[PDB]
Every structure is written in C-alpha cells, then in structure tokens.
Write a protein that binds this ligand. Structure first.
Ligand SMILES: [Zn+2]
Ligand SMILES: [Zn+2]
Ligand SMILES: [Zn+2]
Length: 323
C-alpha cells in the first residue's frame, strides 16, 4: 500500500500510562440545523443535554454528500480539497496507522459497510450489525429493523479481550437515512406527530416529513447517550472519549431537492452542514476545541491521532475537534 504516515509515532504507550478507549459514532444523514444545540426550536437532543462534558460543534461541513464519498474521506490523510474517491481504499488511512501502532480497531456496522476503510485490516475487526445474526435488537418495532443500540451489546467482551490495550471502536449508524425516516426509530421516540408513513413521500405534508426526521434524531440522541454511558462504566481503568460526526446532511424538499448525494458543485447547504459532538471523562486530560471553530471532516483524522497520542508529519498543521 501507499503510505501517508510511515513516520507516525505513538509518544506514550498503554503499558506506561492509562489505556485509552474511544467510541467514534459515524453518523448518517443528520443535519446540523435540526440539532437543538445549533438553535433548532425542537429539543432533538434531550439526553445529550443532560450529560456533563458534551461539546457541540456549530460549524462543521462534510467532505461530500453521500456515504460512499464521505466515509472514506473522513478517515483519509488527504483532506477534502485533495481527496480522490477512486484511489482512497488503496492508500494508508488513519485506522491503518493506529492499528500498526498497536491500537485495537473494531468496526461495527448497522448501515452498509466501511466503504473500503477497513479493507486492509483483518476481516475479524469488521462486524455486520444489520441483521439478527449479530444484532440482538431488531424485534422492537413493526419493521423488524435492527437498531444502532444493538451495536453496544457485548462490547464489554471486546474490552476484556483487549484488556489494557488502546482501543478505537467505530459504530456506523443507520441514523437518519431515508427515505423512510419513520422506520428509523422505535415507537418510544414517536414524539412529533403526525408522521409521514407509507411508501409515497409526496402524499405526506412537509411537517409530517420533518416530524419523522426529528423522531429519528431522538433515537440517535438516545444511541449516543447510551454510548457515553457505556464508556463511563470503563472510566476507572481507561481514559474514555466519544466522537460523533455525521457523514452528510439531508434535503427535505428545499428547492425541490430530496435525500442526499447531490454532487458538491450543486449541493445545497443542508446536505453538507453536519452535527458533531465530543465527550470525554474529566480524567483524560483531553480538551475540546471552541464550539464555533470552523471545522470540516478534515478534523477527524487529526482528532483520532491526538486521542491516542500519535503524531504524523502530514497532519501537523490541521485543526482537530480537540486541542
Ligand atoms: Zn472529507
Ligand atoms: Zn445514503
Ligand atoms: Zn450517508
């Protein structure tokens, strides 16, 4: 493979300082402007609003507008201005670097797959959580659809199997993917009604489409809160943190545009303006950047490296989500 960080050094090791345990929630289809913290007039993140140490970032722009385009760029060394979607999977990415330096990498997926990101690493480090084969939380809704919270089940066994190592766990959400937003959340999150149901989105009033979308965000609030709560159970033995970033936003009819995937040359703001959250325990010494920092997906790679005390020449000048 073609390297970007052959020089990378982990300055400190888990045998000499506390091991570090991080969950990176790779979000899906979530819009910054539907987040309460960014000024949305509905409380779409009530559980995160009750957790001390959550930072919300109000100015984050995605690389692109589809999962296929954005996800590889989120883990790239190139940044958005330089990213090449066709050669991305055959170049060293940030997970390759962290794995080489001894961080135990796990990717659980309730979306599709890692879009090439995990391809160079052992197959055992990727797990499909879209089916009842691996996901124990699919029977809670009329659609028999497997839920993102299912990805948390059994993570204590992974920690036990990597006892005392640094660990980075990616949880790739179904999140707010459409067009059937109403299917994305269990009935306990049907806060905003009426909702757009059925297979004909044009038959639905705009407000009912928004309602379904916002209900799906409530389920994501819950998932991120449960991810933090899970991390908190390991805080004595590990330095624990959680990063959340959505891969792109979503058009909900603005200017006659729906869904996502619009080429960047024409993409409206709602497809690229994404939420991002960072949480850490007080013991870690990790400090968030200012909430209004002008940020992009280019911040992800340097954040992940910084979380594990890794430096790489190519990202020296790059702003992260953390100091
Ligand atoms: Zn990018
Ligand atoms: Zn999509
Ligand atoms: Zn996506």
């Amino acid at each position: 493979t073609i390297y970007h960080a052959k020089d990378a050094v982990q300055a400190t090791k888990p045998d000499m300082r506390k091991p570090r345990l991080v969950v990176f929630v790779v979000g899906e289809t979530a819009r910054a402007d539907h987040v309460s913290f960014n000024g949305y007039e509905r409380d779409t993140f009530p559980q995160l609003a009750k957790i001390d140490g959550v930072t919300n970032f109000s100015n984050v722009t995605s690389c692109g507008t589809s999962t296929a385009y954005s996800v590889p760029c989120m883990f790239s060394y190139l940044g958005a201005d330089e990213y090449d979607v066709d050669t991305a999977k055959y170049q060293e990415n940030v997970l390759d670097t962290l794995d080489r330096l001894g961080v135990s990498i796990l990717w659980r997926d309730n979306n599709s797959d890692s879009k090439g990101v995990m391809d160079k690493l052992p197959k055992a480090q990727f797990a499909d959580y879209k089916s009842a084969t691996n996901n124990a939380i699919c029977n809670t809704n009329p659609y028999n659809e497997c839920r993102d919270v299912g990805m948390l089940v059994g993570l204590d066994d992974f920690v036990a199997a990597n006892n005392g190592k640094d660990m980075l766990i990616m949880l790739h959400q179904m999140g707010n993917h459409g067009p059937a937003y109403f299917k994305r959340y269990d009935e306990k999150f049907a806060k905003f009604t009426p909702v757009c149901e059925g297979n004909e989105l044009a038959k639905c009033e705009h407000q009912s489409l928004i309602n379904a979308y916002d209900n799906a965000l409530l389920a994501t609030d819950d998932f991120i809160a449960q991810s933090i709560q899970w991390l908190q159970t390991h805080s004595n033995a590990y330095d624990v943190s959680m990063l959340y970033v959505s891969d792109h936003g979503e058009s909900l009819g603005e200017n006659g545009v729906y869904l996502h995937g619009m080429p960047n040359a024409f993409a409206p703001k709602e497809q690229r303006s994404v939420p991002a959250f960072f949480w850490t325990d007080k013991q870690t010494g990790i400090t968030p950047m200012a909430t209004d920092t002008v940020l992009t997906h280019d911040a992800i790679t340097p954040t992940l490296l910084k979380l594990f005390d890794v430096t790489a020449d190519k990202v020296k000048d790059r702003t992260a989500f953390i100091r």
